[PDB]
Amino acid sequence: AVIAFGKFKLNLGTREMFREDEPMPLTSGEFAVLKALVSHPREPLSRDKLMNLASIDVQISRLRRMVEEDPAHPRYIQTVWGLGYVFVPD
């Protein structure tokens, strides 16, 4: 699938991403977390659950710098303290 959210399109077959039809590369680890998040929409995944579905803090933070319009106040990939990281689509 090509999961689209906001300005971005994530191609799961070729493991590619596009910001407004411009190709942004993804690390093997960055994709494993991003695909894990967007494959469980509206479900918060704990830190242990994320690692199994693929340090992680760096990948979340480095993904927030690419995806979020305000990485200091994320909307797509936001953290619920006590549960885990959640991805909410449009």
From TrEMBL:
Residues 1-89 form the OmpR/PhoB-type domain. It is found in: Cytoplasm. Residues 1-89 bind DNA. This is DNA-binding dual transcriptional regulator OmpR. It comes from Escherichia coli. The gene is ompR.
